[PDB]
Every structure is written in structure tokens, then in C-alpha cells.
Design a protein around this ligand. Sequence first.
Ligand SMILES: O=C1N[C@H](c2ccc([N+](=O)[O-])o2)Nc2sc3c(c21)CCCC3
Length: 416
Amino acid sequence: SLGNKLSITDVKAIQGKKVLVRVDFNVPIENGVIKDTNRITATLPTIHHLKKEGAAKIILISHCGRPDGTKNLKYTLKPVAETLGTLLGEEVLFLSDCVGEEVAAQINQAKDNSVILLENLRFHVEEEGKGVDAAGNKIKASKEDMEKFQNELTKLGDVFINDAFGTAHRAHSSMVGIKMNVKASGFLMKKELEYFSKALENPQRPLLAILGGAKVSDKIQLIKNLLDKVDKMIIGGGMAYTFKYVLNNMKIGDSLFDEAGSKIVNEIMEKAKAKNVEIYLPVDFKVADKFDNNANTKVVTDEEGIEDKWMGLDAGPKSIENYKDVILSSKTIIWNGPQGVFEMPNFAKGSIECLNLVIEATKKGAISIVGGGDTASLVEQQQKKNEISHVSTGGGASLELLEGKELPGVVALSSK
Ligand SMILES: O=C1N[C@H](c2ccc([N+](=O)[O-])o2)Nc2sc3c(c21)CCCC3
């Protein structure tokens, strides 16, 4: 289950507690300078709630870069402490390790209600459970080494807050081994779990999935899992040409064709029929004579097909018209994939109209979830993030959740 997990707002006893918080501070650092501070800024509601609720210590644990289970000061969290300090308007204490008597002593010695940032968890092989030494030899932590490191992290505090949903798909020490009585989601994780629970457990129906992207192959698990939940599915973008070719023997010219993925199209269509899911493929396309925004373009229907040396780069006007009744009658929308080459303004119309319809449905009461990646970029470029119920930032974890995979970091949270 996803919706019955304990959240930071449900925690009653916070005053005078040492609160251990797993955050996502995997920020790009260019010679001591943080170039993107969004991940740091996104943890402020969690930190503010803990300070306001009178926490004795706010102990932050995270990772960044790729140290591979070895101390590697290129991936030091030291600059993150400085940036977080500036954002908080107070000094954030940075510690050179994350476990042990010395770290414990420094935490206890710190000013009450203050914020402490511990060094990168991934400097320890026990965090990921595997790594690589300096020489390049593979190293692995034994069950006992793992258990000892997990016990050491547990000894740092009294209450555990997991605000790192983007790492919850991993059975890492900081996701599964912090054995405190209260293990609650932080505000970021709370929102992710709340909205993914709304979309996938007992959703408000009709439930619609809007899928797109360049390939079929990397979306098979996602499609097959969503066919067990949804009532309707729009399949668009580059992946649609593979479907039109296999299903209707439609000429696709130089459009994208997924050779491995083409062999699974019939299975997908057969599962959709078994599950009584309505599939909506494009019936027309905006084609181009070159892969370029300034290409010569025209509209072809799926009855005409695409001529040799031409390529489909967006859904056509009829396919765009067909979205309207599908999207506007939907009460829950999971959107994972653009409907064309949105990076080229002349082939963004299908994706932009899909966005306008999803927004319209949301204003009228639908719950809209944007999976991430390219769809999130489109919503961001169009400046419409606040018009969508939830734009997930969980990356790989959001994708695994939608593929029906186990999230160990979620499983390890307390139940409400
Ligand atoms: O790299 C490419 N991707 C695009 C793509 C992505 C999504 C969609 N869509 O149509 O939605 O198309 N379509 C083509 S034709 C084409 C290329 C691409 C590369 C050069 C040869 C011709």
C-alpha cells in the first residue's frame, strides 16, 4: 500500500527530539559552487516544521555524486551545508562523517533546535551495499557490516523522517535500516505517496494514462502495469508509429521504429482487450521532410500513411481533436510522455494541446499526475506546474512505482 504511510504532519512527539532526516541533496557542484539549489530549497518545509515544532536536533543525512563506498571529497556535502545555512538564515553545522561516537558527541554538543548536515552516506560501502575501492576493485558489504552501519545510523536520533522519495526504490541502508519507532514521510515524500496513492489504489474513475515518448521497449513494463489499473490509455509520441506499423501495416517512412518493441505490440493490445481498456492511438500526423523545426510539413491520415523519406513528428489535428472527449471525461489522469517532438516548436502543438486539456480537466475536479522526465520539462517550459495536481520529482522511483515495482524505502515507513 502507498496511502496509509505515516507522515511528518501525523507525528505528535517532536519537541526535545533528535530528528534524523533523509533528504535528497544530490545537487550538481562545480568546484565548490552549487549550480542548482532546487533540491535544497524543496527540503525547507520539512526543516521549518521540525524547528517550529521544537526539535532538539535536526540531523540531515544524504548523498551526492558517485563516491562508490569510499571517502571521496570531490563528492563532499560541505558546500550544501553553506547553501542551506544561507537559505535558513542560520549556521548549519557540517560534520565530516555520518556514524560513530565522535559524530554522536558533536551532535549532542551542538546548539539546541539547530540543523546538522552529516557527510555523504555513500562514502560508506554499507549504504548501497556494494562499491569500488580506489584501485577499481569491486567491494561488497557483508550482512553484518550492513546491519552494524544501519544500527549506527539508528543510534543518531529518536524520530526518523524520510524526505528522499527519489531513493525509495533502492534497498539502501538509509532507506530500510533506520529502526526507530516513528518512521514518517517528510513533506516531499508525503505529497508523492498521497498523489500516487490517489492515482493507483481506489482512484476516482475513469482513470486515464497518457503515454508517449520515443520508444516502445523502455515503456513495456510501465504499459503492462498500467493496463491492470486504467480504464483508458492514450498512446502517442514516437512510440505510436511502431503500433501503427504492426497493427495497421501503415507506411511510416523514416519515422522512429522500435524493432525490439514491435514484437510486443500485439501482446500489449491483447492485454488491453482482456482488461477492457480503451486504447487511443493517433489517426493522423504532422509529417516532415527532415528532422528539423524548419522542415517542409503536411498532415497525413493513418489511411494515407507516411510516404518514404518523410517522418511523423507530432499528432495531427484530428488526433488532437480526439483527445478532448478522452481527457475531459477523465477524473484521474497519469501523464507520462509527450505526444510529439515538443523541443521543436512546430511539433509541440499536440503536446501543448494535451497539456491545455489536462489543465482544463484539473480545474473541473480531475486529479492530474505528471510522471516526470520530458513531460515535467514540457510543463515547466510552459510554466504550468501549478496547474497540474502533482508533477513528480521522484525520477527512477516514480517510474518503478508506475511499473508496479517494490519501493523498499516506502515499505519501511510506519503505517498510520
Ligand atoms: O530522433 C528522433 N526522434 C523523433 C521523435 C521523438 C518523438 C517523436 N514523435 O514523433 O513524437 O519523434 N523522431 C525522429 S524521425 C528521425 C529521427 C527522430 C532521428 C534522425 C532520423 C529521422
